[PDB]
Amino acid sequence: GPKEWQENKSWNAHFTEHKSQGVVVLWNENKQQGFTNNLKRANQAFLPASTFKIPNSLIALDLGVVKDEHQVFKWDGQTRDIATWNRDHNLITAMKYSVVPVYQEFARQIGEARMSKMLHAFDYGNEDISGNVDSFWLDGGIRISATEQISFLRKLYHNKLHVSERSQRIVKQAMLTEANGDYIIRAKTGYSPKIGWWVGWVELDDNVWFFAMNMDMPLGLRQAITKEVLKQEKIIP
Amino acid sequence: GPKEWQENKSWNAHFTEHKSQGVVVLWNENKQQGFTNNLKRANQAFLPASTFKIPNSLIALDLGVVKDEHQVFKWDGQTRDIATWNRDHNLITAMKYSVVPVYQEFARQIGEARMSKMLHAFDYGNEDISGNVDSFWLDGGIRISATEQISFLRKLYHNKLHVSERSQRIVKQAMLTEANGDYIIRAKTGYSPKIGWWVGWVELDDNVWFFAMNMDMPLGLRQAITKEVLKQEKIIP
Ligand SMILES: [Cl-]
C-alpha cells in the first residue's frame, strides 16, 4: 500500500538548472503524504540559521520578552553590513529582514534554561543549544532536518505547540510572505555559509502544502527552486 | 495648526475615468491624518452590505457560533447564482468569496438581542439592526459611513474592540487579501445593487494606511479605483 514518503527525482532538474544541490520536501495535509527529491537529504539535520526565528519568536512571545507584534526594538546604533538591519524593527519586520541582532537580544532575555526547556517541549531538531544562547542557531550545535521542519511547522499550523494559541497566531502572522487570490505563503528564509533554507507552507482554499527546502552554499534561488516544484505539482499557477 | 482631515479632489479623476461616483477615505496612522476626495460623502451613512461580514465574523467567533477558522459550514445543496457559493466553506473562504448564505446562518444563530447588543458595544454605525436578523446589512436599517468604517477598522487593528483578542486576530487573518514584499492588504468588499464598498488597510514596514471607499451602483472598479489612489499617494508601487 501507499507510503508516508515518496521520492520524486524529477525535481532534481530544478536544482540542476541552477548548478545547485539540495532537497525540497512537500507535505500534502489533506492526503497525509509527503514527497521529496532526496529522502536521505530530507532527513539530514543542518544548522537552522534564520529559520530558527520561528521558534525563537514563539518563545519570546510566550514569555513576554516580546509583548506583541507592534513593539519596537530600537537599533543599537551599530552599523552592520546589511542595511535593513540598521533601523528600528518590530517582530514583523525583524522576521521579514532576518534581523539577527534583534533576535540575539530576544535569545539573551529568554536565557539558556528557558530556551532549552522550550525547544525540548517543541520537539525541535536535536534540541541542542550548546554554544552561546544568542548564536547557537548560527554557529552552535543545534541541527534540524527538512522533515523535522515539516513536523514542527505542522504543529504550529494546528496550534499544537506547547505555547499559547496567541503566540502561535502571532508568529504565523509574522511568517506571512506572499498572498493573492490563488494562495497564501507563510514561510521563513535562512542563510548560513554552507546551507540555505526556505521553510513554510502554502495555504489553498481546501488544502495546505507544507514545504521545507535547503541547498548548498547560496539567495533568490531558494524561493525560485521551491516555486518551480510548486508549479510543477500544480500547487500554484 | 495642521488639519486632521484634508480634501484632495484630484482623486475624482480616478472615479470619472470609469464614469463612476464615490468616495475614497484614507487614514495615515503614523500622522493621525485623514484624506478624502469628498468630505461630505466620507461622513454619509450607507448600508454596509458585505462589509458587515467583518463585525458578523467577530460576533460569531466571540459567541462560539463559529469555533475557529477551520470549522466547515457545509453547502446546503441549493444551487445559487455565484458558483463559488455552491460548496463547503470555512470562515476564511466564506469571507474570501463573500458567501452570504453562510453568514445569514451565523446571524440567525447570534439572534436579534445579541446582534444589537454587540453592535452597540462596537459603536458600529447607527447600531440599528431593524429589518431581518439575517439580512439587515443588505436591506434593513443599519447604516455606516466611510469614516465610521475607518474608526471601526482602527479599533480592530489595535485589538481595541470589545470582543476577545482571539476573535479579532482570527478576523484579521480572514481579511487577508494580498501580500508581497512591499505591502499587506487586509480588506473586505461589499456589494449591493445600490452601493459598492472596499474597506480595510495597507500595512507597510513602518506605517499602516486605513482605507474605506464606496461608490454608486456597481465590481473590480472598487479595488482598481482604490489602488489608483494608493498609487498616486505613493503608498503602493
Ligand atoms: Cl495573516
Residues near A46 by Cβ (< 8 Å), separated by ≥ 6?
Answer: A143, A144, A145, A195, A197, A214
Contacts of A27 (CB under 8 A, 6+ apart): A33, A34, A35, A150, A154, A209, A210, A211
User: DSSP H helical segments within chain B, as ranges?
Assistant: 12-16, 39-42, 53-62, 91-96, 100-110, 112-122, 136-139, 146-157, 165-174, 221-232
What type of residue is A6?
Q
In whole angstroms, how far apart are CA A51 and each of A24, A47, A183, A190, B128? 15, 9, 21, 5, 49
Using alpha carbons, select from B168, B166, B171, B170 the residue that is nearest to residue B158. B168
At A29, give phi and psi (nearest 5°): -70, -40
Distances (CA, A) of A28 to A5, A151, A230, B157: 11, 12, 12, 33
What is the rounded distance in angstroms from the CA atom of residue A173 to the CA atom of residue B176? Answer: 10
User: What φ, ψ does residue B171 adopt, rounded to 5°?
Assistant: -70, -35
B173, B178, B203: residue with CB nearest A180: B178
User: What does the block give as the cell for B17?
Assistant: 475615468
d(CA A153, CA A202): 12
Look up the CATH number of the domain holding residue A85: 3.40.710.10
Residues of B with active-site annotation? 50
CA B222 from chain centre, in angstroms, equals 12
Mutate to test the interface with A, among B86, B89, B158, B178 (most CBs of A within 10 A): B178
DSSP class of B233: T
CA dihedral sign of residues B126, B128, B133, B139: negative
Q: Are B171 and B201 in contact (CB under 8 A)?
A: no
CA separation, residue A107 to residues A128, A132, B49, B73, B88 (Å): 14, 10, 47, 42, 43
CB-CB contact of B115 with B133 (8 Å): yes
- Please give the distance, rounded to the nearest whole angstrom, from the Cα atom of residue B174 to the centre of ligand 1: 7
Helix (H, G, I), strand (E, B) or coil at B77: coil
**Has residue A237 been placed in a domain?**
no
Q: Which residue range(s) make up the domain with A191?
A: 5-232
Residue B151 lies in a domain: yes
Which uninterrupted H or E stretch holds A222?
helix A221-232
Q: Largest alpha-carbon pair distance within chain A?
A: 60
Q: Which of A48, A20, A47 has its CA nearest to residue A199?
A: A48
Indicate which of A172, A176, A186, A204 best probes the interface with B, i.e. most B CBs within 10 Å of its own CB: A176
Exposed/middle/buried for B81, CB within 10 Å: 0-12, 13-18, 19+?
A: exposed
User: A142 vs A163, B76, B147, CA distance in Å?
Assistant: 20, 51, 51
Per-residue CA distances from A68 to A93, A95, B193 (Å): 13, 13, 41
The closest alpha carbon to B141, from B122, B127, B120, B123, belongs to B127
Helix axes B53-62, B112-122, angle to 10 degrees: 110
- Residues on A contacting B at a C-beta cutoff of 8 Å: 88, 92-93, 96, 165-166, 169-170, 173, 176-181, 184, 205-206
A84, A178, A189, A236: best mutation site toward chain B, by most B Cβ within 10 Å?
A: A178
Identify whether the C-beta of residue B139 lies closer than 8 Å to the C-beta of residue B49. Answer: no
Closest residue, chain A, to B97 (C-alpha) = A181
Q: How much of chain A is in helix, strand and coil states, percent to nearest 5?
A: 40, 20, 40
Q: Which residues of A touch B180 (CB under 8 A)?
A: 178-179
Backbone phi, then psi, for B213, in 5-degree steps?
A: -130, 145
Known active-site residue A50: yes
User: Does residue B211 form part of some domain?
Assistant: yes
**Per-position b or e across B187-211, b if 16+ CB within 10 A of its CB:** bbbbbbeebbbbbbbbbbeeebbbb
The helix or strand, by DSSP H or E, that contains position B22, with its residue range, turns out to be strand B22-28
Contact between A176 and B180 using a beta-carbon 8 Å cutoff: no
Measured between CA atoms, how close is A92 to chain B, in angstroms? 8
Amino acid, single-letter form, for residue B73: F
What is the three-class DSSP state of A233? coil
Query: Is A173 close to B173, i.e. CB distance below 8 A?
Result: yes
Q: Could you give phi then psi for residue A66, rounded to 5 degrees?
A: -110, 120
Query: A164 vs A56, A116, A187, CA distance in Å?
Result: 14, 18, 20
Are the C-beta atoms of residues B185 and B165 closer than 8 Å to each other? no
In B, what residues contact A, Cβ < 8 A? 93, 96, 165-166, 169-170, 172-173, 176-181, 184, 203, 205-206
Half-sphere exposure of A117 (CA within 13 A, CB side): 10
The x, y and z cell numbers of residue B180, run together, are: 508581497
Radius of gyration of chain A measured on its C-alpha atoms: 17
CA of B141 to the centre of ligand 1 (A): 32
Solved how? X-ray
Is residue B228 domain-resident? yes
- CB count in 10 Å sphere of residue A208: 18
Q: List the Cα angle B19/B23/B28 in 5-degree steps.
A: 135
Task: Tell me the β-bridge partners of B189.
Answer: B198
Residue whose C-alpha is closest to residue A148's, from A100, A185, A197, A112: A197
- Of residues A165, A166, A176, nearest to B179 (C-beta): A176
Q: Which residues pair with B195 in a beta bridge?
A: B216
Q: Which residues contact B40 (CB under 8 A, 6 or more apart)?
A: none
Instruction: Give the residue on A whose Cα is nearest the Cα of B95.
Output: A205
What is the distance in A from the centroid of ligand 1 to the CA of A77?
31
**Measured between alpha carbons, how far is B191 from B198 in angstroms, rounded to an integer?**
9
**Pairwise CA distance, residues B93 & B77, whole Å:** 17
- How far apart are the C-alpha atoms of A35 and A20, rounded to whole Å? 19
Sign of CA dihedral B9, B13, B14, B15: positive
In chain B, how many domains are there? 1
If you ran DSSP here, which 8-state letter would residue A74 be given? -
SS3 string, B158-175, reads: CCCCCCCHHHHHHHHHHC
Q: What distance in Å separates the CA atoms of residue A1 and residue A219, rounded to the nearest whole number?
A: 39
Interface size A-B, in CB pairs within 8 Å, comes to 38
For residue B209, is it left (φ>0), alpha (ψ between -120 and 50) or beta? beta
Distance B179 CA to ligand 1 centre (A): 9
Of A169, A170, A176, the CB nearest to B184: A176
B69 within domain boundaries: yes
DSSP of B177-204:
EEE-SS-EEEEEEEE-SSEEEEEEEEE-
Q: Which three cell numbers stand for residue A185?
A: 505563503
- For residue A81, the one-letter residue type is D
CA A101 to chain centre: 18
Contact B52, B94 (CB under 8 A): no
Chain A neighbors of B165, CB-CB under 8 A: 166
Asked, for residue B124, whether it belongs to a domain, the answer is yes
* Residue B166 forms part of a structural domain: yes
Can you tell me the distance from the alpha carbon of A154 to that of A196, in angstroms, rounded to the nearest whole number? 21
Which chain A residue lies closest to B177 (C-alpha atoms)? A180
- B237: in domain: no
Where do we find the cell 441549493?
A: B78
Q: How many angstroms separate the CA atoms of A137 and A45, rounded?
A: 12
Nearest CB neighbour to A184, from listed B169, B176, B206: B176
Cα separation of A148 and A154, whole Å?
10
* One-letter amino acid of A131: G
Q: Tell me which chain B residues have a C-beta less than 8 angstroms from the C-beta of A223.
A: none
User: In angstroms, how far apart are the furthest CA atoms of chain B?
Assistant: 60
Distance CA B210, CA B148 (A): 12
Q: How far apart are CA B58 and CA A31, in angstroms?
A: 31
Shortest distance between the Cα of B124 and any Cα of chain A, in A, equals 25
* All three cell numbers of A197: 533554507
For A159, name the nearest residue in chain B, comparing CA atoms only: B68
